[PDB]
Amino acid sequence: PFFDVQKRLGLDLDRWMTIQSAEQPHKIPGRCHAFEKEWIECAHGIGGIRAEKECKIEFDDFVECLLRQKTMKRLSAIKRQRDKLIKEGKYTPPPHHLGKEDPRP
Amino acid sequence: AGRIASFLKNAWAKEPVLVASFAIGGLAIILPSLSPYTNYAIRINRATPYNYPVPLRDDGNMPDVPSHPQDPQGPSLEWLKNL
Amino acid sequence: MPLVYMNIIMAFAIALAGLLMYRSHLMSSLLCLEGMMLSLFIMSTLIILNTHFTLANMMPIILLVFAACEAALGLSLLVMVSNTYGTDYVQNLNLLQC
Amino acid sequence: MNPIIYTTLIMTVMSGTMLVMISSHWLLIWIGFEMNLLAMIPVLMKNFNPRATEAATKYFLTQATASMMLMMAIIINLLYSGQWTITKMFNPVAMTMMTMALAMKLGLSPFHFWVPEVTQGISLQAGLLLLTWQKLAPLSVLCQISQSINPNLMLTMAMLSILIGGWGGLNQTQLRKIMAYSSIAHMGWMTAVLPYNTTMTILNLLIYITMTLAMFMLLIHSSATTTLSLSHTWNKMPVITSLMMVTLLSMGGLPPLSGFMPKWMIIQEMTKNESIIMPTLMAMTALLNLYFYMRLAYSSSLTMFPSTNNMKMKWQFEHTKQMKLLPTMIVLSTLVLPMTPALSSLN
Amino acid sequence: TMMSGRPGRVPLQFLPNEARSLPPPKLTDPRLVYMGFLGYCSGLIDNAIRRRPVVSAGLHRQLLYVTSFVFFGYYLLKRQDYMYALRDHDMFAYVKSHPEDFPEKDKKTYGEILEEFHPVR
Amino acid sequence: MTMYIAFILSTIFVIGFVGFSSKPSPIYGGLGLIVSGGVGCGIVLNFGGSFLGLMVFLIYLGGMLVVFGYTTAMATGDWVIYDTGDSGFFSEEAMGIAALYSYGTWLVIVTGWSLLIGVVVIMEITRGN
Amino acid sequence: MNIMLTLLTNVTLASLLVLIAFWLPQLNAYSEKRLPFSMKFFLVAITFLLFDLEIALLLPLPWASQTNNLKTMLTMALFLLILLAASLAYEWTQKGLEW
Amino acid sequence: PGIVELPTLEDLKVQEVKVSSSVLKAAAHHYGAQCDKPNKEFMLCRWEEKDPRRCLEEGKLVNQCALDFFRQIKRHCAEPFTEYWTCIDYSGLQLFRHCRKQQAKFDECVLDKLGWVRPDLGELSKVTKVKTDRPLPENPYHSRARPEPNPEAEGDLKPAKHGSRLFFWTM
Amino acid sequence: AKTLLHKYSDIPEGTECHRKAYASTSIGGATGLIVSAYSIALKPPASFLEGVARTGRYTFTSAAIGAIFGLTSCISAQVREKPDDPLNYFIGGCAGGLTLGARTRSYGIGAAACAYMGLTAALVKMGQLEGWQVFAEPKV
Ligand SMILES: CCCCCCCCCCCCCCCCC[C@@H](O)O[C@H](CO[C@H](O)CCCCCCCCCCCCCCC)COP(=O)(O)OCC[N+](C)(C)C
Ligand SMILES: CCCCCCCCCCCCCCCCC[C@@H](O)O[C@H](CO[C@H](O)CCCCCCCCCCCCCCC)COP(=O)(O)OCC[N+](C)(C)C
Ligand SMILES: CCCCCCCC/C=C\CCCCCCCC(=O)O[C@H](COC(=O)CCCCCCC/C=C/CCCCCCCC)COP(=O)(O)OCCN
């Protein structure tokens, strides 16, 4: 099946592209560098089953960074409630959200 | 020796384009390993600052790291200026 | 998961269904394969660019190259079929049967 | 074709399979599959004819669809977890689609339809290479992710494959279609033990490869494609017919021949996981494979079919080309039961 | 068992160094004799296929078959024995490290154990 | 907001895929494929990957679909997943793509060998006999 | 936005000019009264496609020159171009470029 | 899970630098040479804390230092600097190459008045050391405790007890 | 999916005959639709109308078999006053086979279907009682 020639010879044929946080050119960081680093360090040398059971918090944070489903849900809820209130007329946006603010450098 | 020269003379006639192409390709392959300026090109590429140089935290045991940009310590680009 | 990814996967599924429908004209089958490949390219490009996975920017180009090669191969086979039958109808490939 | 070009294409096929087996990146695995498919097509078309062209185009269409499905599964897995390494799939939909892609590549039912026709159209040499070598990359990939595959899908596909191979082998008369259905049934047997023990999968793969290599080399030696052409063989080389009958009995799972080692062992493994109904069903189904193997043996060696006058001239000429490793293949496929525990070598 | 991911495993070693701590199989091992017999059978089949005197066509070829089979059989037996020793070592270490999951059975005597008796009539 | 311009382009992509998926008169299906490819390149360019979009628009449309048409004629919600920081004094996509020669030596080797074998395979298949 | 406006203006102007050119002569009433399939064309099309793929591989060279791995980048670029030349040579010697 | 803490708007109030980009680029070299210490302290703090909310004081310090630098420039060399930044501003790319003459005039004026030496090539890109009293953060990633590793037992190999123990095989 | 199986299994065996019959009819209809789709894909008879006739007859046959099996099994379980007895499932399977034979209109298929469907239903009931596993999870 998997004949690990690379680890036997220390060649690094294709291991540099496997993860986001592995020696990017000009040290350009990935969007989720910190979360991936945390999860990788949590799950190293632990085994698949134990990594799945024990490092679930880090993987959940990593997936949240990748897809941001919960952030989208929260923003959508806030926007919908604001729209409902502005339809009923009990809420008025501040000048900052109307373009009348004073911008800063 | 004689056969190779005769073959080259034959090819230089009735087929100059292929001879020129092969000569240029061989020169382009061979020459860079001999030119002394390739290390200069590598050094010039290395000396271009693309990212912000993050300062190190002083602990009193870094004599080679300058404390100010004007200080004599650190790499110098006088060789590039002379080029 | 935003609507753009959903639309891209929907396009891939539609192209796969078109490939598997097989009305006639094997050229249409090749076109469906290449539509699936284009959808794959778009989806991979969006995913890689969104997460700033810099070293993965190589992946689409490579993909495209290989896939295009396959397309070329497929076209060659199609040509031979026509050269044996005069036309590229799918129903003509019925000599071999289970 | 030119011998150098043929050797280069064979090296490229082997290099693609090696790249699939030795790589830890999904993109590199897909590249290996593409290289294998690209170089495998001219091998089918070495002897140019309409049947070979049609078989090659069917094979190309199926493999290209499988590769596209595999790439889509890789993309979804990357989307839901930014990982390229071949490990736990981290997604159910991606795992399902990758399982279908690897089933298409392998030939498991209901994606089995292309195997009999592709085997029938293409030559014996091409068929031999396609039947045994092609299985190594998809099986390695499946073994690498066996901890994530859904047992229901793999088990039902394996059961369907065994049923379909057993039923379809009864009707066929041409030897190549019989071999195609035999391969389908053997892969149904072999992929059923993937969720439990991959070592049994590798052992069954090795035994099946040895048996089918021996049988295809015997069929090439006595240049027979249909059943009657094989029945004519006894009048010239009876030893070939006897060896072929012994190998056919081995391939049916009859003890103490080598072909009994995998099935038995596989059953044992599924009994350790409290799976009792399924091994019984697969055994009673493999009885059908045994039946059509026995019919072939009756036609070939155990009875003497009528011969032809011109066969007299064939008595005076000897087989000019001898294929090495045929006796070794026969011995390994018939008399290696007493060394069963060597499977602990994690072969 | 799946000892593929066992920690500290060299990726492509047929026989690790620790496997030298085990007794090598004897040269008169019955399994080695069986490999020699397989080699002889292969030689006889090779003679039969080529249409040559089966018993006494090529003595060098039969000798080479026997020797190759014995060589591979010896090395395969060494690897098999090493793998089984590894399995037993892991078993015993795990059963020692987890006493809670393998409690000592309260030893009992047949005198104070009631087994139902089913007469045969 | 531009009526979800990314969503508009995605819907037009799906519409073109449906149009050419019915496989009517393969030349017309081809035309639908060019339309869909142009829309996809528009999506990629709008997202920010200028080089990859131009790569599609050059390779795919100009060469590969053109060869497809040649052979045919011969026969008978958004904007929220984005970033916050800057890329510096370069384009990240261009740097990642140009890292193919300094990092991806293995990829270059395997792709070049595959292309050469593809040339050989095409010649062998189209030789005939 | 600017490029979209430019493309729309170009297409609109071209379409308007084409339709007015097509319809200006249409106001005035008037009388108002295969097999071959040459293989060489397909072969040249396929060769162009494959060389286009190799050019696509070669394209990022202008940015590939600033890497500090000048030896490796140079070796890889020359390897790609040598493979392109070898493919052309194989097509040449096996009579793949004949009319 | 948890509540994010954000500084009040009174904590983010500071005298902004209200000059355009061309003006900043005109005096970029002298600004880097003179105002180096607060900038380096702020940037080291930013890279070590990995948190914008822990580096407000250094931001206010760098703003104040830049304002002091520009006030000195306004006091002493207003007119040559005005000409220099006007020329830099005119160009689309804001190239230093266009008007080296105005740059030379500004440099000589500021060397006469304030005795400032323009940094040479390869000096502002040096990596430097910063002497600060801010404690080194012990755990900036806010990581949890790493799970315990596997037992990885050790011992001397012994022959398998009674061989393979596979069905009837005694060896 | 597995929702229909859950609907069938949630009901107690000895009660709610109509609900059991409805669940069995739904399962039979789903199986008939699947087999009709496969037959249509693999053997397009002549046109759209013949195809819809074939799929309708297959679905109706399967639904009738399922409904009869469920109704008979539940009625036998209630009347015998002895639940969890595989005999009720055997009677249900034989009744389903009898309706299959009546639909196909030949006594041989009716008798064979009765035997081989009562046996299968009894085996299913025995497995449900003893917890037999068809797709066993990978314990070891
Ligand atoms: C008929 C039965 C099959 C016979 C097959 C042909 C026999 C000849 C083959 C010649 C030797 C094979 C291998 C060559 C030795 C060097 C390669 C060695 O380094 O590989 C090791 C491994 O060695 C091989 O695996 C063992 C080969 C032995 C095969 C024989 C077992 C057959 C059992 C039943 C038949 C008994 C033998 C009959 C006579 C041969 C490395 O293992 P590792 O990389 O860490 O793990 C990879 C597998 N994983 C991924 C699943 C974990
Ligand atoms: C080792 C086994 C040799 C014999 C077996 C060969 C098997 C098939 C041939 C293919 C294997 C060749 C191995 C090449 C692997 C590439 C990686 C290795 O070579 O290191 C590279 C060294 O580069 C070398 O120049 C590779 C040159 C090899 C390519 C030239 C010839 C290749 C031919 C191979 C077959 C292709 C078709 C046939 C052509 C004739 C990396 O350079 P480096 O700078 O440290 O790292 C950069 C990454 N950083 C930024 C993180 C530091
Ligand atoms: C190792 C470097 C390689 C890379 C550099 C070159 C890259 C690109 C150039 C090659 C592209 C492909 C070349 C394909 C070669 C095909 C050869 C061939 O078949 O052509 C022969 C003819 O060509 C020949 O004669 C044989 C080869 C010609 C000469 C080859 C090179 C000679 C030596 C080159 C080096 C010269 C010495 C160096 C001098 C340095 C300066 C002092 C047939 O002629 P036709 O055109 O088909 O007939 C038409 C008329 N009826």
UniProtKB/TrEMBL annotation, chain A:
Disulfide bonds: 32-65, 42-55
Chief location: mitochondrion
Job of this protein: Accessory subunit of the mitochondrial membrane respiratory chain NADH dehydrogenase (Complex I), that is believed not to be involved in catalysis. Complex I functions in the transfer of electrons from NADH to the respiratory chain. The immediate electron acceptor for the enzyme is believed to be ubiquinone.
Keywords of the record: Disulfide bond, Electron transport, Membrane, Mitochondrion, Mitochondrion inner membrane, Respiratory chain, Transport
Assembly notes: Mammalian complex I is composed of 45 different subunits. This is a component of the iron-sulfur (IP) fragment of the enzyme.
Cellular localisation: Mitochondrion inner membrane; Mitochondrion intermembrane space
Keyword presence, Transport: yes
Xref: PANTHER family: NADH DEHYDROGENASE [UBIQUINONE] IRON-SULFUR PROTEIN 5 (PTHR15224:SF1)
Protein name: NADH dehydrogenase [ubiquinone] iron-sulfur protein 5
Family: Belongs to the complex I NDUFS5 subunit family.
Membrane topology (UniProt): Peripheral membrane protein
Gene Ontology cellular component terms for the protein in this record: mitochondrial inner membrane; mitochondrial intermembrane space; respiratory chain complex I
A Pfam family reported for this protein in Swiss-Prot or TrEMBL: Ndufs5
Entry's Gene Ontology BP terms: mitochondrial respiratory chain complex I assembly
Automatic annotation (TrEMBL), chain B:
Function: Accessory subunit of the mitochondrial membrane respiratory chain NADH dehydrogenase (Complex I), that is believed not to be involved in catalysis. Complex I functions in the transfer of electrons from NADH to the respiratory chain. The immediate electron acceptor for the enzyme is believed to be ubiquinone.
Subcellular location per the Swiss-Prot or TrEMBL entry: Mitochondrion inner membrane
Superkingdom of the organism of origin: Eukaryota
Encoding gene, per UniProt annotation: NDUFA3
Family: Belongs to the complex I NDUFA3 subunit family.
Disordered as annotated region, ranges: 55-83
Subunit structure: Complex I is composed of 45 different subunits.
Name the UniProt record assigns to this protein: NADH dehydrogenase [ubiquinone] 1 alpha subcomplex subunit 3
Automatic annotation (TrEMBL), chain E:
Protein name: NADH dehydrogenase [ubiquinone] 1 subunit C2
Source species of the chain: Sus scrofa (Pig)
Subcellular location: Mitochondrion inner membrane
Membrane topology type: Single-pass membrane protein
Function, in words: Accessory subunit of the mitochondrial membrane respiratory chain NADH dehydrogenase (Complex I), that is believed not to be involved in catalysis. Complex I functions in the transfer of electrons from NADH to the respiratory chain. The immediate electron acceptor for the enzyme is believed to be ubiquinone.
Signal peptide: none
Pfam family for this entry, one: NDUF_C2
Main location as per UniProt: mitochondrion
PANTHER family (UniProt xref): NADH DEHYDROGENASE [UBIQUINONE] 1 SUBUNIT C2-RELATED, NADH-UBIQUINONE OXIDOREDUCTASE SUBUNIT B14.5B
Family (UniProt): Belongs to the complex I NDUFC2 subunit family.
Gene Ontology cellular component terms for the protein in this record: mitochondrial inner membrane; respiratory chain complex I
GO BP terms in the entry: mitochondrial electron transport, NADH to ubiquinone; mitochondrial respiratory chain complex I assembly
Membrane-spanning parts: 61-77
Keywords: Electron transport, Membrane, Mitochondrion, Mitochondrion inner membrane, Respiratory chain, Transmembrane, Transmembrane helix, Transport, Ubiquinone
TrEMBL record, chain H:
Organism: Sus scrofa (Pig)
Oligomer status and interactors: Complex I is composed of 45 different subunits.
Name of protein: NADH dehydrogenase [ubiquinone] 1 alpha subcomplex subunit 8
Biological process, per Gene Ontology: mitochondrial electron transport, NADH to ubiquinone
Keywords from the named record: Disulfide bond, Electron transport, Mitochondrion, Repeat, Respiratory chain, Transport
Ranges where the CHCH domain occurs: 77-110
Any one Gene Ontology cellular component term annotated for this protein: respiratory chain complex I
Residue spans of biased composition, Basic and acidic residues class: 145-159
Superkingdom: Eukaryota
